[PDB]
Design a protein around this ligand. Sequence first.
Ligand SMILES: NC(=O)c1ccc[n+]([C@@H]2O[C@H](COP(=O)([O-])OP(=O)(O)OC[C@H]3O[C@@H](n4cnc5c(N)ncnc54)[C@H](O)[C@@H]3O)[C@@H](O)[C@H]2O)c1
Ligand SMILES: NC(=O)c1ccc[n+]([C@@H]2O[C@H](COP(=O)([O-])OP(=O)(O)OC[C@H]3O[C@@H](n4cnc5c(N)ncnc54)[C@H](O)[C@@H]3O)[C@@H](O)[C@H]2O)c1
Ligand SMILES: COc1ccccc1-n1cc(-c2ccc(-c3ccccc3)cc2)[n+]2c1CCCCC2
Ligand SMILES: COc1ccccc1-n1cc(-c2ccc(-c3ccccc3)cc2)[n+]2c1CCCCC2
Ligand code: NA
Ligand code: NA
Lengths: 493, 493
Amino acid sequence: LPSPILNPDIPYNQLFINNEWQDAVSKKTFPTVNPTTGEVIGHVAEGDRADVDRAVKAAREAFRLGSPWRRMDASERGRLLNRLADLVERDRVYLASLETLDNGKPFQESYALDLDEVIKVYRYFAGWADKWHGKTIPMDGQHFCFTRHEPVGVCGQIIPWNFPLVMQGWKLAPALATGNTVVMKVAEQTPLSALYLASLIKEAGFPPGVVNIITGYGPTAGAAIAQHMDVDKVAFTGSTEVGHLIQKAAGDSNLKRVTLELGGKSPSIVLADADMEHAVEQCHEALFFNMGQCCCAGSRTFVEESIYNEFLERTVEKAKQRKVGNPFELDTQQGPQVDKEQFERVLGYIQLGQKEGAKLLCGGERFGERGFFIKPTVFGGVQDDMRIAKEEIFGPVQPLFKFKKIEEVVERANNTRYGLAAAVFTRDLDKAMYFTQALQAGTVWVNTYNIVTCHTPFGGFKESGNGRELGEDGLKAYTEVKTVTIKVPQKNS
Amino acid sequence: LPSPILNPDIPYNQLFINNEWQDAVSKKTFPTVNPTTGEVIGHVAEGDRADVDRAVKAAREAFRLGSPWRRMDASERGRLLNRLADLVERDRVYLASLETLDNGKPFQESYALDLDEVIKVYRYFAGWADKWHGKTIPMDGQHFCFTRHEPVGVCGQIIPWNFPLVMQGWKLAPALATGNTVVMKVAEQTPLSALYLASLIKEAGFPPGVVNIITGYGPTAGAAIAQHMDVDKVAFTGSTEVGHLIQKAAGDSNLKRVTLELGGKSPSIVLADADMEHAVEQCHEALFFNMGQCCCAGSRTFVEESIYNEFLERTVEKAKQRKVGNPFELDTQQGPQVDKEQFERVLGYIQLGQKEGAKLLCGGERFGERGFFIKPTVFGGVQDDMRIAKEEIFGPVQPLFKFKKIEEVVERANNTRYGLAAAVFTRDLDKAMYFTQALQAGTVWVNTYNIVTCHTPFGGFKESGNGRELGEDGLKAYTEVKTVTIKVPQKNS
Ligand SMILES: NC(=O)c1ccc[n+]([C@@H]2O[C@H](COP(=O)([O-])OP(=O)(O)OC[C@H]3O[C@@H](n4cnc5c(N)ncnc54)[C@H](O)[C@@H]3O)[C@@H](O)[C@H]2O)c1
Ligand SMILES: NC(=O)c1ccc[n+]([C@@H]2O[C@H](COP(=O)([O-])OP(=O)(O)OC[C@H]3O[C@@H](n4cnc5c(N)ncnc54)[C@H](O)[C@@H]3O)[C@@H](O)[C@H]2O)c1
Ligand SMILES: COc1ccccc1-n1cc(-c2ccc(-c3ccccc3)cc2)[n+]2c1CCCCC2
Ligand SMILES: COc1ccccc1-n1cc(-c2ccc(-c3ccccc3)cc2)[n+]2c1CCCCC2
Ligand code: NA
Ligand code: NA
């Protein structure tokens, strides 16, 4: 609704360590690109292992028994996160503009959805800080037994490019609320918004070293965090393939605690009794939201046989109508893909789908001449043995499948290494209930899609992840439990 | 205290798979020794990778949607676990006699402590089965949101030899309470008691495939479970060294969920205002319990300067008084070490302690000339840089340490990669409270030691583990959370 800042000042482009801005040890930089124009926005510090070492020492000292951050009331940690959120709300237009600049997402998305969720996640976990309780336990013998929920310690946090500020907030908010310290590695494709957010962390009054932000490449700066002997926990959001490596690196270094939020090939399932127009609209947005670059995208749309043709025609019409263009104009629905490599990878899958025997119904090529835009693409007659049915495309390509039986579609839905999310559309109580049990996914939506808020635990079954983020259940990965058992003179109930 | 059975019949010595007794595919068998005499009791099946695949297959079928185990009331899982407890109680003397035969622990411990704990853990988790609740969540928008606590699936469980029945129960009870199926790999040194327990699992009425027991080696049968692509979760108890390999294997295979319960070098810390006789006795048992073969053994005794000489002298006398001998004798306090390799490892550490300049105060050699018996051994003047101060001896060797300040002893206690347990002995409220905060351990005892029951969460900080077993908190490792979010017509509070 408000007006975007079309080319803003970008003062922050260095490492954030110990509440100060600094270059890498090596003084090296790397470019970030504006994906709409294909042009370089500017350069950013290229952090590597030595820079990580500096951030870890800073985080380690901020966490020391008797430190400000350790001594401080849990409620003061809350007040800080709440003030941080106030500051995000003050700078909301700038941040949303910066996000659209660097990532490519439509400013209507950045402003109204992403920034809304950033603010809410910081405010939500602000409230948890002083409400996270251990237990008193009526154990056998002359004993008083309780648990303390202590912080896990120095948390390495590695995030992707598709929702730079949201992903940052999902990591930082619960970690800080439970009194941890942080070394965060943001994505090479989208470093800018996270650095401005770091400036607001300092402004909010977080002590030095509580949050440290590192820009750099995955195999260098990322890997240094996952392998570090003085990092107590790693929380990784990214690809399933890198997920495997993170877990191995934990096993290979110091048995750091691991949470993994990985890839998806999530199914939308539309039954015959569904509200047709609603299901078509929901499945359409389930795929094309954020240009198909959403980890829980409805990337397989399964449709009952008796409504398939109608559903298909209406789906193609919505794909053809979706406005592709400059994301700074307010009615733009689909911006560009994030970079050249993603661009080419999505076009590669479009070709592959054609070669495999799937029917290209619309789009299927580049939109325009400048930047990394792709026309909304829909495939029909897709088979489970096709590669476009199996691999995570991560772009604006919607494959359609046909099924006949309830039991058939659950098996097909579940026949994947992935298990991040799923959805059913139906009017029937009994079928909705069956699907909520039968679908092997961390989140099951009924008659909706992509409703992930600060309250809703989120993560994968199978190779889509290990552990959950968000909600109360999301606090548990940032907590180390201590049992205290004390001999007492006598015991009464 | 009842009479042990000295010559029990041992009918069960095969793999337990799909409620059927089976040979290994290879027909290979391996011997288990009676550590009291050093003689072979008999042979058991040498399960390998092919046998694990067979067990995992049976567990998977038992876990399938619509199987007896999946559709059973949670309360019926409870009744099954309760019935198992009744059968253990019925066969308590037999089970405890077999434990002593195979492992070497005194029958006084076996009957009155171990078997007690086994019965309790099954009964405890029997009660959790129908009381493990998810949540309803007052989420934003026109939504009904809740969580299902689903079983994680096929759980690979690998246990050590030091408490064979208890370690089995700690694994099986929470896993079964929460609706999982199991493939368990028991320790090569102590296969027998776990197989008799499996026959009780069958008698109690658990469906085929819900519990599967594999006997065999670590790098074959155990490795096969940890690397298996159809195992959803691995819960491992054992050395820290092998723990690193389990976490790597999970990351190298299918991102199976991991819990690790690993080694320790736990400190008991005696302040000058402690009750002397009590602290001496408690620290003595804290090390010598189960022939020093306890993960959370008080294996570094720190004593304040002003009471050290007296403490030392009383500790020596107590070591010299401990009855070493045949574990079937009701007053034996110390049986043999578990096998030749463990026996020689402990003597090697005794030799090493004296080379490093530690002072041998008593014991320090073999007890007699048959079986694997070692004289209770105490070292004085031990320094933090000695190998016997840093490494897990896992035998009846008690090193004593001198300190002067609280801030000193906290640093020295905490300066290890281990973190399973710790204890403080004091009369002073403020000092007890301070140590419960400052010690980096999963369990902190105050004026007691080794009080780990079905109620009390247990596990390591740092390299002593990942996650917690027992209590309510121990259910979490066996639970996969599913968030269900449903569009509703209107929302009211
Ligand atoms: N489940 C979720 O919450 C969630 C959310 C958003 C995105 N994703 C997933 O993220 C993926 C897309 O993002 P991506 O391409 O940036 O994936 P990625 O695995 O290539 O990179 C993710 C992050 O890890 C870093 N990285 C890369 N290699 C590394 C290594 N060897 N060691 C340590 N760090 C390394 C990158 O620099 C980046 O910061 C998709 O598969 C998507 O499904 C998941
Ligand atoms: N934290 C706890 O609850 C707890 C309780 C009891 C014992 N322990 C620890 O257990 C250790 C002693 O037991 P242990 O000597 O039998 O240790 P271990 O690590 O050598 O073996 C433990 C189990 O794992 C298997 N194993 C061995 N190598 C393996 C491999 N490479 N892959 C898969 N499985 C493998 C063994 O056959 C056995 O069943 C000590 O360090 C002790 O502290 C911990
Ligand atoms: C920042 O957002 C996300 C980040 C990650 C994952 C998912 C989301 N995501 C995606 C969507 C979302 C829902 C519905 C539509 C839509 C629009 C028109 C017609 C029909 C449906 C578009 C987007 N939302 C969210 C956040 C949570 C609730 C608010 C809405
Ligand atoms: C099966 O046992 C265990 C298994 C694993 C870990 C610890 C134990 N463990 C060890 C002990 C234990 C406590 C106190 C003494 C003692 C005796 C004489 C004088 C002073 C103290 C001996 C043993 N207990 C337990 C379990 C139940 C709690 C109470 C009993
Ligand atoms: Na960019
Ligand atoms: Na034996």
